[PDB]
Ligand binder design. Structure first.
Ligand SMILES: Nc1ncnc2c1ncn2[C@@H]1O[C@H](CSCC[C@H](N)C(=O)O)[C@@H](O)[C@H]1O
Length: 261
């Protein structure tokens, strides 16, 4: 019924070539060539990011959509690109990363970029059921894509319900993935969270056109419904006239070393 749902139905109708051409049209991409090189070698003394995902939190951080500070929780940390980025920030005290790391799911990668000494990881951890702990900064990049919209809305809702469970009164800063923001249920859940916590929803330009994902962040205020539809219209406009060409940016590179306090 919504414009986003129309986008989803049209995406599921594209052929391979149409799909591949559409998914990169006018998006932004990091050059991952250097990092792939060193990750294959197995080098831990070079200042690369363990994931493509780090580019998203850098963008949000540098643009002022969120502050990164104090005790940091990274829920669904995967390889740990959000965790290592956080640990290199001078206002950051400690970083704790939780992820599944089971069959098919990625595990934490050990790296020695700046502040590695104040990062701790735990796999075999389900953030939906495990006990919560306090934080000043709460991060969550969870939300697996699906061609089924009802699967996407269920995964999204579950992420948002768990975020509310995790958020502490000290948690002034937050960044939560919203996989399928086009669903009316998801809009209603976001509006209700916003009433309590403030903040707003944003589209990160590093997301491919083949996902409608957006991020619920703490450092901006906006109209949820208007922001979701502005992205839907944008994703629809690109589908009609796909450029096939992405913007390339330099990757997330960090210093190495330990940090004091
Ligand atoms: N219920 C759950 N509990 C813990 N981790 C989960 C989870 N559901 C999904 N995940 C994990 O969440 C991760 C999202 S990918 C994380 C990317 C990360 N921001 C980075 O830059 O590296 C996946 O690895 C998936 O295994």
């Amino acid at each position: 019924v919504t414009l986003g749902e129309v986008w989803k139905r049209q995406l599921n109708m594209l052929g391979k070539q149409e799909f591949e051409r559409y998914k990169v049209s006018d998006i932004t991409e990091v050059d991952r060539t250097a990092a792939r090189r060193y990750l294959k070698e197995g080098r831990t003394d070079v200042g690369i990011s363990v994931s493509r995902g780090a580019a998203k939190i850098r963008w949000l951080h540098e643009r002022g959509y969120l502050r990164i500070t104090g005790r940091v929780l990274d829920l669904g940390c995967g390889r740990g690109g959000w965790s290592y980025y956080a640990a290199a920030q001078k206002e950051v005290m400690s970083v704790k990363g939780y992820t599944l790391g089971i069959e098919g799911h990625e595990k934490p990668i050990h790296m020695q970029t700046l502040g590695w000494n104040i990062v701790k990881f735990k796999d075999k951890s389900n953030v939906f059921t495990m006990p919560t702990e306090p934080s000043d900064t709460l991060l969550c990049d969870i939300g697996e894509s699906s061609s089924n919209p009802l699967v996407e809305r269920d995964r999204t809702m579950k992420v948002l319900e768990n975020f509310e469970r995790w958020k502490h009164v000290n948690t002034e800063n937050f960044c939560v993935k919203v996989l399928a923001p086009y669903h009316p249920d998801v809009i209603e859940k976001l509006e209700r969270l916003q009433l309590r916590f403030g903040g707003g929803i944003v589209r990160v330009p590093f997301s491919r056109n083949s996902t409608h994902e957006m991020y619920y962040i703490s450092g901006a205020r906006n109209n949820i419904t208007h922001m979701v539809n502005t992205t839907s219209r944008s994703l629809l406009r690109r589908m009609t006239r796909p450029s096939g060409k992405a913007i390339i940016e330099g990757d997330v590179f960090l210093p190495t070393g330990t940090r004091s306090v």
